[PDB]
Design a protein around this ligand. Sequence first.
Ligand SMILES: Nc1ncnc2c1ncn2[C@@H]1O[C@H](COP(=O)(O)OP(=O)(O)OP(=O)(O)O)[C@@H](O)[C@H]1O
Ligand SMILES: Nc1ncnc2c1ncn2[C@@H]1O[C@H](COP(=O)(O)OP(=O)(O)OP(=O)(O)O)[C@@H](O)[C@H]1O
Ligand SMILES: O=C(O)CCCC[C@@H]1SC[C@@H]2NC(=O)N[C@@H]21
Ligand SMILES: O=C(O)CCCC[C@@H]1SC[C@@H]2NC(=O)N[C@@H]21
Lengths: 235, 235
Amino acid sequence: MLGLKTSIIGRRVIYFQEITSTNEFAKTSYLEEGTVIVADKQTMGHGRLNRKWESPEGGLWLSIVLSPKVPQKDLPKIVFLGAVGVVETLKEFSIDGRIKWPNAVLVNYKKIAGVLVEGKGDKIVLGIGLNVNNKVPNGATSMKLELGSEVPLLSVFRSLITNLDRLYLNFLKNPMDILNLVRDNMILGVRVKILGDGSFEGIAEDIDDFGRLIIRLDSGEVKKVIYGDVSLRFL
Amino acid sequence: MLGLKTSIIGRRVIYFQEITSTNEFAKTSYLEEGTVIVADKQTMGHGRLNRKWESPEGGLWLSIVLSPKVPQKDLPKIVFLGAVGVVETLKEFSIDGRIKWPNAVLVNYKKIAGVLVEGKGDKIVLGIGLNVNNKVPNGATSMKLELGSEVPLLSVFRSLITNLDRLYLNFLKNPMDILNLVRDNMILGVRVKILGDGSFEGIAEDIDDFGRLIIRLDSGEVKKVIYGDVSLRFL
Ligand SMILES: Nc1ncnc2c1ncn2[C@@H]1O[C@H](COP(=O)(O)OP(=O)(O)OP(=O)(O)O)[C@@H](O)[C@H]1O
Ligand SMILES: Nc1ncnc2c1ncn2[C@@H]1O[C@H](COP(=O)(O)OP(=O)(O)OP(=O)(O)O)[C@@H](O)[C@H]1O
Ligand SMILES: O=C(O)CCCC[C@@H]1SC[C@@H]2NC(=O)N[C@@H]21
Ligand SMILES: O=C(O)CCCC[C@@H]1SC[C@@H]2NC(=O)N[C@@H]21
């Protein structure tokens, strides 16, 4: 009854009034490529390292099952499809979303969305949490708060799925294209701090051909960051 | 993201751009009670017996998984929940539908919807096909044709699911209530012919406490028709 006209993403959609986590359901269940798992609310939503992700009613909490036929070296780029898709959807609603490398989107430096990719070999799950009309934790924002009025949640869903389908289809053809879109919509030229096994500060210059964040430290040393288990903090 | 407020029917919804048959999928797949299977188009949609059910884009083709904890003798009334739900939804859109015992809804004697109940294991599958904006076979009709304008498909879905959830919840407690709703909304007092071996004609008088169609033959004999492979024609 939804009438989606996408090629892969959105071929099937499983909607839940409530779920533990769309990412967990997607990783666990036997699902075909392109199936979207979406829920009004999540009771156990999470980000990286099992950190809690607040998922009250009003927001867009979904996961997409992907089976990309691409070399191992290209899989780390899937998170960017989610980040860019969100930025494109936000621009459609006239919201200035900017990417915080490599899995978040901010509006005036406040987090409005997060992306979490999980994958075991053949199946890759692309999880996206976007604050639309829901209450958010301090330090975050939502589409409603930015526009000053409620936004039709289904319209946001339709917009995002359409954008993601296009981005994904092109990714399979030209896996490098997404990097340019990330560059054009990411926060750069400002000081950041990388928190991993130890830490360091510097200017976030750009992302390289592998999607690694290029940081120039005050000494001039250049470091290439692979997100993994590191956190980026703005100064 | 659909924000359904129903109690049982609609707790989960599985949407397909395209499917063979929502009834077939619902029967062969493990699904919790209340799960709704819906598709934009069915390639192998079917009615009773071995007859095709045209399911092009624009219509509402869905199946609902139920596992009613009620006496065995009440189970045959599930088909009526579907028929009455359609009638209630049609009224909301200012269309007057009448039930053609035991599984169809007509508008000015033109078929606008059909109901098909099947069961695998101890789960019951309630299938409903309603013509909304889609083209229909000659002699049939649709919400669009009756209103002279496009009808928001999702609005029809929301309305129908809401009515069905209410009807089902009450059915679980008061399984006889549905019968009076059918009586007040079905075509009675007219001549009909029951096809097949031992065929016969008479006046469709009412439905009894089991949902059987009561027919008075010209001789005065009264026959009780159970709704199975029953083919009925208006004379
Ligand atoms: N609904 C929400 N909207 C915005 N931020 C949220 C929401 N729920 C939780 N958070 C915050 O997001 C964090 C998510 O975990 P995680 O460290 O994996 O995020 P990240 O995207 O990798 O890093 P960052 O929060 O710096 O963008 C939580 O620790 C919490 O501070
Ligand atoms: N989209 C549709 N809208 C209305 N009628 C349809 C549609 N697709 C098929 N039909 C008609 O509905 C019939 C469906 O099969 P089935 O015999 O099981 O229905 P039925 O309700 O028992 O028949 P009837 O109401 O005509 O006595 C087909 O034989 C066909 O004539
Ligand atoms: O910012 C992050 O660290 C990532 C957050 C990812 C949130 C989404 S909500 C849909 C999906 N289900 C989950 O449990 N997590 C992701
Ligand atoms: O009038 C009839 O004989 C019954 C038609 C039932 C049609 C619906 S469409 C949704 C579901 N899937 C099917 O293949 N049939 C039912």
